[PDB]
Every structure is written in structure tokens, then in C-alpha cells.
Amino acid sequence: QSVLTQPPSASGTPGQRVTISCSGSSSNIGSNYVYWYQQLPGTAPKLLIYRNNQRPSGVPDRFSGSKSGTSASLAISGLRSEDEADYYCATWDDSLSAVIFGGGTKLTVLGQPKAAPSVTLFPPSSEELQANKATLVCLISDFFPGAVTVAWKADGAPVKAGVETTKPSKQSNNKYAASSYLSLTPEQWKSHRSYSCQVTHEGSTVEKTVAPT
Amino acid sequence: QSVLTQPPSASGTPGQRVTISCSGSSSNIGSNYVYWYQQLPGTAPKLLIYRNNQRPSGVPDRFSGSKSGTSASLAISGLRSEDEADYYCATWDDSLSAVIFGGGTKLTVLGQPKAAPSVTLFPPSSEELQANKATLVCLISDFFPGAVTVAWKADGAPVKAGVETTKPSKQSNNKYAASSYLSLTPEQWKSHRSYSCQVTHEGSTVEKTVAPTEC
Amino acid sequence: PSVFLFPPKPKDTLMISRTPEVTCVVVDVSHEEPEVKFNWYVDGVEVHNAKTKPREEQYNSTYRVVSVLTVLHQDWLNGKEYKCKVSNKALPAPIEKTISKAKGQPREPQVYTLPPSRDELTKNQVSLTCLVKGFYPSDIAVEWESNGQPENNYKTTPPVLDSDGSFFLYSKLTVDKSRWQQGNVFSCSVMHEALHNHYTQKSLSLSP
Amino acid sequence: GGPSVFLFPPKPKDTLMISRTPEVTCVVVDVSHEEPEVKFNWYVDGVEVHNAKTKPREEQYNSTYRVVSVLTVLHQDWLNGKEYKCKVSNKALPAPIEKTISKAKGQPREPQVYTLPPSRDELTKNQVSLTCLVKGFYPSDIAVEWESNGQPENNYKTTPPVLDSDGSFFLYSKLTVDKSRWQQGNVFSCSVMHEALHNHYTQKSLSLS
Amino acid sequence: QLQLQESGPGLVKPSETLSLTCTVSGGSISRGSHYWGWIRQPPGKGLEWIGSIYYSGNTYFNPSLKSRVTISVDTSKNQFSLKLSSVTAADTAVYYCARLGPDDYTLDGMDVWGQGTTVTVSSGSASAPTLFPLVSSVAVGCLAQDFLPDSITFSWKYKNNSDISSTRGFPSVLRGGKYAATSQVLLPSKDVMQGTDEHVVCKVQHPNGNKEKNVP
Ligand SMILES: *[C@@H]1O[C@H](CO[C@H]2O[C@@H](C)[C@@H](O)[C@@H](O)[C@@H]2O)[C@@H](O[C@@H]2O[C@H](CO)[C@@H](O[C@@H]3O[C@H](CO[C@H]4O[C@H](CO)[C@@H](O)[C@H](O)[C@@H]4O[C@@H]4O[C@H](CO)[C@@H](O[C@@H]5O[C@H](CO)[C@H](O)[C@H](O)[C@H]5O)[C@H](O)[C@H]4NC(C)=O)[C@@H](O)[C@H](O[C@@H]4O[C@H](CO)[C@@H](O)[C@H](O)[C@@H]4O[C@@H]4O[C@H](CO)[C@@H](O)[C@H](O)[C@H]4NC(C)=O)[C@@H]3O)[C@H](O)[C@H]2NC(C)=O)[C@H](O)[C@H]1NC(C)=O
Ligand SMILES: *[C@@H]1O[C@H](CO[C@H]2O[C@@H](C)[C@@H](O)[C@@H](O)[C@@H]2O)[C@@H](O[C@@H]2O[C@H](CO)[C@@H](O[C@@H]3O[C@H](CO[C@H]4O[C@H](CO)[C@@H](O)[C@H](O)[C@@H]4O[C@H]4O[C@H](CO)[C@@H](O[C@@H]5O[C@H](CO)[C@H](O)[C@H](O)[C@H]5O)[C@H](O)[C@H]4NC(C)=O)[C@@H](O)[C@H](O[C@@H]4O[C@H](CO)[C@@H](O)[C@H](O)[C@@H]4O[C@@H]4O[C@H](CO)[C@@H](O)[C@H](O)[C@H]4NC(C)=O)[C@@H]3O)[C@H](O)[C@H]2NC(C)=O)[C@H](O)[C@H]1NC(C)=O
Ligand SMILES: C[As](C)(=O)[O-]
Ligand SMILES: [Zn+2]
Ligand SMILES: [Zn+2]
């Protein structure tokens, strides 16, 4: 009655055609124009379709909008990779008297089985040790899909915590990326020998190591 | 001042970016929106550009127009084959109080430009010469590009009108074909010293002749 | 006591079936000498026929004496004059009145329907406006409607004297946003002498 | 049957633009030559005042006078509904004639302003009509003027206020402009002044995008 | 053509009041044919409309939070602004300023959006960064911790001050109420165009100071 609902996610495969629905109410999506915005990872949303199905000059014919009843849907044809982003529907809701958006829809064009995580490890700096700080940086570049269980261990047995890892992030190569950092007092970089940064990317645990010297 | 004017001829290579213009007065294209219509040879005009430079649904992205002072123009970027047709531009004229259409601009695509205007001429029929007629036919066969010209003459001095000629026309060959006739009565043929049908396919004045020869 | 002579409804003088009529009234007439007299003349010439309802008691120690006279269409439309002579007591020279159609080369109205402004579309009711301009004389009738049946929630401004000598006015119809968004057509109907067949119409609606 | 009086209100504009000076006018008409002297007595809610200025009596063509008396009023006294009474006394008057005025009573309502383009088919003419719709205001005192690039405008007229079905008023103002000015891209403005508005003023602009 | 740029404190402490500003270029809000507004989006979740304003002042707010929002425009400087008071953890997101829909007076769509602007409701107060030169086809980077309001315009400069056609921006990680990100930059074996060999430059931008360091 007061909020649009779209599929949390979608995904397809190149050259294909997919549709995203926006289930709404009469107080909104059923009595007003629907809008569709596209949001490629870490970017300001882009207007995709206005007034149910108008494409602002600069938007592909493959993108089409439509409404019927209290629902609308966006449809992508001739899918590409430059199309996996987040999409949202929006309209005015006369009940609340305000603009409203759906939750959003993921959608990821399935393909490119090539995910070569060119991992890299860096031994702390001299300025750091000269300041009680053994900060190791395991910079792991691209890899599709973006998900790995990076592993940090000393010599052989893995250590509890002290190491913090972020989340993936679509790069320019359109490949998710991340990075991890290990703490542990500076009286350990010289105390122990060799530190490894494993990264099990669905089997392949490509990794690198640094010498305490 | 009250009639849009466009280059009677256009046409260019596939991919090339062609530009058709429409010039006029303030009274019209100067002060009112401009519309562009594309008429595919043999079919009903189609709305291409409206309100100076808007494109309706079901229209290639290659198309786009623009106004200026008292002249605007349509331009096809990435010119193609199924982009050859007549292009009319039109606007409302505040002095006439009516829509005004340009002259129109014909444009063909380029490909296999081998013009073989195999012209032929058939003298008046046996039975024709009876009904008091002397229809002279000139069957200018296939060629390319679609466009030619004709001119009939008695001896050397060319006969004026009476030489209605059909317009070019495409074949399966995508090569065109047309023809031309010449009135004249029998008392005109059996007399003079042979007539002539001179075609003209881009320069070459290919021509043949028929004579009052009884064989 | 004052006099008030009123003209016929534009709608009435344009539809033949209907019956136009000029109304004469007498405001502020005490209970003492209420009894009045009514004399009606058309361009001098006269005729006896003008129904006259009783003195409707009023809320200020007075009455409202009204005298109506039925007229002929083309007579009104053809600038005819009408006189009403009210004869009373506190009236030595019983006030008279004269009225006729407006003089001047009639002019045809142009009708323009205007859609709601896009920001009014956040209210749950929108305005459909009808612009009626360049007409003369000012006698005119305008009404809205959809699906044969006539709409009710609409208002029309008084005729306004424009700069070029003609009149114009606006008529505002209010419809629920939902009826508009859905694409139902609405019509502005105008009746006026200078219009062919004394009537034109203009529809308005959200083009799909 | 002496003279008769008339008490006019201040112009709507002068009461919404705090920087101006609104005033009520008490006009006594039909003053004989035999007794041309008329006395004005002003009051603001019963409290008589003395800051009124009487203009010298003007001679009329029908052998009588027209006398005028004006009272400046405070921006706030008028808009707060204060009542102004003008008492008129002249020898040809058995008893003085009193008259009263003041803003209409009833809760004020903030109007909405809508600008509406010309119908596509008026564009075959040489002049186009831009429309400004002011709806939902109360009380009915309002002012409306069109404007472009600074200077005001000449060809525009404004309908009188009109009582809507919900109890408030609405009016339309019509600006006429050379079709060319419109098609170029000029930006015209509709300026409205109503107490209920913010700062008593608001403006809506219309133009061909 | 037309653009909108958000401007504001990348940080706001609880109970305080956020304050941003939007500058328009290649379009004059003063034209009065469109409404302008603000939309926020918490990192995780999706989009949320806040409010729109017309050049003449009249504004429209989102009932969910109007009681604590303030929007205004300044025709003179051609820009509008936002004010969110009593900020908590919810009010933490990227704040975009866009123009409303393509049609005149649209009030339900945004056709042109601003670059975006993050706004974290922290409590420890900002602080600049502290860089540290890190250790065919070899390369290195330059870590940096300490800084809180993430926003470090990384980049690199060769020996004789040259623009490295190679740069990268890794995800910043928060360790104890402070962030710290790296940045690797692949390089040849020892050739390039204008790069000798005596280390390089690590240009690190930031609202609270742009620290730089050389990597051996
Ligand atoms: C005692 O009560 C009576 C009446 O009862 C009163 O009771 C109260 C409790 C209230 O309810 C009150 O409303 C009610 O009136 C009072 O009499 C009234 O007195 C006033 C002021 O003196 C007078 O006002 C005039 O109004 C006209 C406008 O006409 C309409 O006015 C009212 C609505 O606006 C309405 O009450 C009137 O009845 C009248 O409505 C029209 O009535 C006719 C007759 O029924 C309708 O006729 C139609 O005919 C059709 C035929 O086709 C069809 O049959 C229809 O069914 C039928 O209805 C007509 O349609 C209807 N109008 C509509 C469509 O609604 C206004 O024009 C006057 O203008 C002024 O006149 C002055 C003198 O006349 C001038 O000095 C001024 O300059 C000004 O205009 C100029 O007038 C001169 C005249 O010399 C012209 O020459 C000059 O051209 C004019 N210049 C201009 C401006 O253009 C004036 O404002 C009311 O008319 C009157 N009510 C009536 C009719 O009884 C007493 O005043 C009370 N005593 C006191 C003092 O307390
Ligand atoms: C001898 O001549 C006198 C006048 O000179 C005449 O000379 C001859 C030679 C010719 O040139 C004549 O044309 C010329 O007039 C005659 O006086 C006239 O008497 C009649 C009545 O017998 C008067 O009629 C009344 O008129 C008012 C409207 O007033 C305006 O009339 C015109 C405009 O159309 C104009 O001429 C006149 O000056 C008035 O306009 C101006 O009025 C204000 C004056 O300053 C201006 O105020 C503004 O104030 C602001 C303040 O900040 C600023 O200062 C501004 O600068 C300032 O202008 C105003 O703007 C301005 N307006 C304009 C644009 O002109 C009507 O409203 C009266 O209405 C009716 O009155 C009857 C009473 O008979 C009522 O019963 C009716 O219902 C109705 O009104 C209702 O009245 C009740 C009573 O309380 C109320 O409760 C209701 O609410 C009322 N209804 C309404 C409307 O709400 C009425 O018609 C006429 O004005 C006089 N002419 C004058 C003085 O100029 C003599 O009669 C004549 N002698 C004889 C016997 O022959
Ligand atoms: C401030 As408002 C919504 O009352 O115009
Ligand atoms: Zn009684
Ligand atoms: Zn308000």
C-alpha cells in the first residue's frame, strides 16, 4: 500500500534479455508515472526511464519501461557486461505525499569465468618499525566473482585475529577487488619468519610470502 | 520567403555522413518548428524529425536535425543502404497560414556502380501505322545509379515535347530500368530521315537510332 | 426604492427550444405601498405579456418585486431594446430602464484547453483549464463534460475586456488526479452567437 | 436627501508590500454649494484617530462637490482585521453618516501558482498566450503582474477573483507575447502578492525549455 | 552542459546537524522551470528522497524526516543547500543533489544528478593521514593510516615529476575508528619515458591535509 517491491536481484547472460518488476500500490505506482534509474557500482544513480517508458536521449533502445495495473517493469535486451549494476523504480505516492524507491535489484551478467587474483604482499616500513607498527599489506587485485577466504598464518599454524580484510570492489577492469592488513606487534616481524597471505578463490589459493629480513 | 528549398540531389557512400539542408525565410522555418519526413521510394512519407530535432519511437539513432536562423538541416551519420529515399523538410508558414513542404531531396546509397544503360529502340508497329499512329519506344534497360535523361530528334534538330518519359525504376538487379516514348503521326515518320533516342547516364550520352528502312 | 432590469441568459437566447426572457426587479420596497406597475415596450412598440410573480417577503422590512417578459431570439440577437417602467409611491417619476444586446461587429471565440501544470499533479485533484478568447459580444456560455454526462465541479470567470477590444475568460474544471492520469477525456463546450451553429467543443485528455 | 458617502479600501498591493503606505478613502459626494463644509471623524476599532488628511473640496460639473478624506493605515492594523470607521457630518445631513470597512473575516489560505504554456495550435498565430493560474487563496485581495528580464509587461490582463467550490478564490492572469519572443527561449514570470503567501509574495516562471 | 556539485563536511558528530551545499553549472536555477532536490543512500541499502525546492523558495519535504530538515536556494550564487539536524547513525550516507525529472515542474523524478558526497556521523573528529613508503613487471605502493573521513585522492609522480599512466584505488579499511588504505602501481623493469630510478612520488589528497611520501 505504501512501498514498491522489486526483486532483490536478477542476473542473466550476454546477448539475452531480462526484466525487472516493481510491485506497488494504487496510492503510488498505480496512479503516477514510474521512473527507472541505473546505478553502476559506486556512482550517482543515472536516469534510465521517465514517465513509465520514455528513454532520455542517451539511453539504449534495449532499455524499455512499462506499467500496467499497479506494477511496472524494466526490460533489457541484448544484455552486455556494462549492464550489471543496481536498478531502481520510483514514483510519487499520494498516500505519503513523497517520492519513493523500491529496494533495488542486483542483476549480474553471468560470464567471464577468468578470475586471476594477482595477490601481492608488502613487509612493513622502517618508519613504521621506528614507531611500533607491523602493518603488512596484502593487495589482491582483480577476480570474478569477488569473493575469497583470504588466510593469514605464521610459519604453519594460522593466527587468530589482528588482520582486517575489506570487501570486493569492481575495478576499471570490471573485476571485484579487495585488500587485507595484518597488525601484530613489530616484535613479531623480526621474531618469526615468513608470513603468508593465502586466498582460496574457489580452490586456487594463489599466495605470496615475505621474509622477516 | 514562403517556400523551403533543399538540394534536389544527395546520395553518398555507406558509412559516410551525409547532410541535407532546408533553407527559407523568417516567416516560416525561421519562426516555427521544423519537421523532417522520409519517404521510401514507393511508399508513404514517414515522420523522421519533429520539433526541430526530436526522433519518434522506431527511429535509428543515426538521424538528427537542427534549426538555425532561417535554415535548418537533417543529417544522416553512418549513411546506409536502407537510408536511401526522398527526404522532405516542412514547417508552418505564418504568411501563407499553411504548412509548407520543401522541394524534397533524393538520396541513394552507393554500391556496384556499374551503369550499363542497354538502350533499345523499336519503330512504329505495322498495325499501329494503321490506326494513324507512330509511337516510338525507347526501352532503356538496366543500369545504376537510378537516374538518366532522354532527348529525341529528327535528323539533328531535336523535337520538343510529345516525348513523355517514364521515371527510373528498380529491378531485382537492384539495377534500374525505364523507357521513353515519342508521339508523332505516321505522316511524320514515313517522311523525315530517321529519329534518335539519346539517353544520358552520368555523362555518357549512350544513343541508338532507327530508320524509315523497310527491313 | 431602486430598479434593476436584467437581460436573458446567453444559453437561452442561443438554443431555440429554450425560452429567453428579460427580468425586472424592484429592490427596497416597504410594506406600506408595495403595489406596483409594469409597462414593457420593445423599441417603442409594445405588447401585453409579462408574467409577474408576487412580492416575495424579504429579510429587511421590504420585498423583491420581479417582472419577467419572454422575448424572441433573433429579436434579442438583433439588438432590440426593452423598457420596464416601475410605478410606485416614493417614486414621483417612476424609474425606467432600457437594455439591448451589445453593439459592435461580433467576433468568433477561439477555444484552448490547457492541461494541469505538472507540479499540480502531486495534489489529489487537478485543474483542467479552458481558455476562451477573442469573442464579442461578451454573452457566452461555457460548460464542461465527459462521457455524455455533464461535469459539475467547474468554475468560469466573468468575461474580461481584453486589450484588442474583444473579451476572454477562463473556465476551470477540477477532476480527481486518478481520473486524469487514467486518460479520460474532458470537454469544454462553448455557446456563442458568432460560432457556427452557435456552438463549438474542445476536448482535453492525457495522451497515452 | 443630502450627500452620500463611500468608504474604499487600500489597494491590495500597498498592503502586502510592507514598504508602502496603504490608506482608506472616505468619499463624500453630492455636497451642495449652500453647505460645502463637511467634517470627517475617523476611528480604528472605536478608537478615534486624528492623522487623516482631507484634500480640498473639488468642484463638480453637476453643481456639487466631491470631498475626500484619507487615512494611512498600518501594514499590521489592516491585515489583522482592524475596523476603520469614517463619520461624516454636513449641514444637509439630518444625522451624520457612518461607514465601515476592514479585511474580510475568515481564515486566510495560501494560493498555489501555476504557469501554463500556450496550446500548440495557438502557435500558428503571431501572438501566444501564457497563462498563470492562482488558486486556493483567501481572502480575495490579491495582486498579479507579469514580468520578463526585469522590466514589467504591457500586454497582460487579469480576471477578477472568483469564488471556488471549496470556499477559496481562484483567478487567471493572461500574458500575450509576440510568438517569436516565446519560441526564442525567453523566460517570463508571474508575480503574485497575497498575505497568505510567504513574505506576501511568490513567483512562478514559465518558458520554453 | 548542466552539472551539480555537492559540498560539505565529510563528518558530523552525533546530535549535531549536517550541512551540505549544491552548486549548479550550465543551467540557472533562476530559470524557474524545474525543481531541485536532495537524495541520500546509506552505503548498504538503497535510495531515499529528502526534499525539493523551487527557485522562489517553496519546498517539498519527505514526511519521514521533514521535522529535522532544512532546504534553501540562493539565486545569486546559483546553488541550493541542505541541513539535517540531530544526526544519528542512520543519517550516514552519500548525499546527491539532482534536478527533478526532465519535464518542467516535475516533482517525482531526477534527470540530472550530482557527483555524490559521503557523510559519516563519527565522534572522534577528523585527522590527516600518515604515509609510509612500501616494499619483469615489479611495483610498489604507499600505505597510509590515521585519517578518519575517508577521501584520499591517490595518484603518483615519477622521478622528474611525471604522470604515471598507472594508478589504483583500493578499499579503505576501518581499524579502531580510523581508516587506512594502500595503492599498488605496476611498473616495467626500469624504462618508462620520464622516470629515472631515485624512488617516486606518492600524492595523497585529503580534506584535512594532503600528505606526500617517496617510495624506494
Ligand atoms: C434588502 O434585500 C434586497 C434583496 O435581498 C437581499 O437579502 C440579503 C439578506 C442578501 O441575501 C442579499 O444578497 C439580497 O440581495 C437587497 O437588494 C439587492 O440590492 C443590491 C444592492 O443595491 C443589488 O445589487 C446589484 O446586483 C447586480 C447583480 O445582479 C445580481 O446581484 C445579486 C447577485 O450578485 C443578486 O442578489 C441579484 O438578484 C442579481 O441576480 C440576478 O437576478 C436576476 C433576477 O432574478 C437574474 O435573472 C435571470 O434571468 C434569466 C432570464 O433568462 C433567468 O430567468 C434566470 O433564472 C434569472 O435568475 C440574474 O440571472 C441574476 N444574476 C445571476 C446570473 O446570478 C449588479 O449588477 C448591481 O450593480 C450596481 O447597480 C447599481 C444600481 O443598480 C449601480 O449604481 C452600480 O453602478 C452597479 O452597476 C451599475 O448599475 C447601473 C444601474 O443604474 C447600470 O446602469 C450600470 O451599467 C452598472 N455598471 C456596471 C457595474 O456595470 C448591484 O450590485 C441586488 O441586485 C439586489 N437584489 C435583488 C435583485 O433583489 C436590498 O439592497 C436589501 N436592502 C438593504 C439596502 O439592506
Ligand atoms: C454628481 O457627480 C458625482 C460624481 O462626479 C460625476 O460628475 C459627472 C459630471 C460625471 O463625470 C460622472 O460620471 C461623475 O461620476 C456623482 O457621484 C457619484 O455617485 C455615485 C452614487 O450616486 C457613486 O457610485 C458609487 O461608486 C462606487 C465606486 O467608486 C468608484 O467609482 C468610479 C469608479 O468606477 C470612480 O469615479 C470613483 O472615484 C470611485 O473609484 C475610486 O474610488 C476610490 C476613491 O479614492 C479609490 O480608492 C483608492 O484607495 C487607495 C487606498 O490606498 C488609493 O488611495 C488609490 O489611489 C485610490 O484610488 C479607488 O481606487 C477608485 N476606483 C476606481 C478604479 O475608479 C461603487 O462602489 C458604489 O457601489 C454601490 O453603491 C450603492 C449606493 O448607491 C450601493 O447601494 C451598492 O450596493 C453599491 O455598493 C455597495 O454599497 C454598500 C453600502 O455600504 C456596501 O455595503 C457594499 O459592499 C457595496 N458593494 C460593493 C461594491 O462591495 C457606487 O456605485 C460614484 O462613485 C460617484 N462618483 C464619484 C464620486 O466619482 C453624483 O451622484 C452626481 N450628483 C448627482 C445627484 O447627479
Ligand atoms: C510552505 As507551504 C507547503 O505551506 O506552501
Ligand atoms: Zn412583513
Ligand atoms: Zn506556506
Tab-separated table of N, CA and C in Angstrom, chain B residues 6 23 42 63 77 96 173 176-178 181 184 190 206 212 215:
chain	number	residue	atom	x	y	z
B	6	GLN	N	15.588	22.681	-50.670
B	6	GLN	CA	16.617	21.704	-50.337
B	6	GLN	C	17.338	21.243	-51.597
B	23	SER	N	16.578	25.545	-46.586
B	23	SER	CA	16.715	26.977	-46.344
B	23	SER	C	15.428	27.735	-46.634
B	42	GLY	N	8.349	4.494	-53.363
B	42	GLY	CA	7.225	3.586	-53.481
B	42	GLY	C	6.340	3.512	-52.253
B	63	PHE	N	19.999	9.378	-37.147
B	63	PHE	CA	19.226	10.553	-37.521
B	63	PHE	C	19.181	11.646	-36.469
B	77	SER	N	24.236	10.275	-40.100
B	77	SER	CA	25.595	9.864	-39.766
B	77	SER	C	25.655	8.354	-39.914
B	96	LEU	N	1.560	32.539	-45.167
B	96	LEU	CA	0.625	31.818	-46.027
B	96	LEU	C	-0.499	31.264	-45.175
B	173	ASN	N	17.696	-6.811	-60.043
B	173	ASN	CA	19.095	-6.494	-60.260
B	173	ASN	C	19.499	-5.323	-59.376
B	176	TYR	N	18.470	-0.255	-62.145
B	176	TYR	CA	17.201	0.320	-62.522
B	176	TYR	C	16.849	0.078	-63.977
B	177	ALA	N	15.669	0.539	-64.375
B	177	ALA	CA	15.192	0.393	-65.743
B	177	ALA	C	14.049	1.372	-65.977
B	178	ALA	N	14.007	1.951	-67.168
B	178	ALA	CA	12.972	2.906	-67.513
B	178	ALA	C	12.754	2.834	-69.009
B	181	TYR	N	8.828	7.244	-74.752
B	181	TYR	CA	8.054	7.162	-75.982
B	181	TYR	C	8.067	8.507	-76.689
B	184	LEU	N	4.246	11.609	-82.470
B	184	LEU	CA	4.442	11.684	-83.918
B	184	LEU	C	3.474	10.777	-84.674
B	190	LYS	N	7.197	8.126	-91.904
B	190	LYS	CA	7.472	7.685	-93.264
B	190	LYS	C	8.097	8.787	-94.122
B	206	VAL	N	24.933	7.647	-74.259
B	206	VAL	CA	24.657	6.412	-74.991
B	206	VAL	C	23.407	6.620	-75.842
B	212	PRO	N	13.682	4.860	-91.405
B	212	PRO	CA	12.472	4.506	-92.153
B	212	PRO	C	12.726	3.305	-93.060
B	215	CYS	N	13.049	-2.724	-93.433
B	215	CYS	CA	13.611	-4.026	-93.093
B	215	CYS	C	14.377	-3.935	-91.777
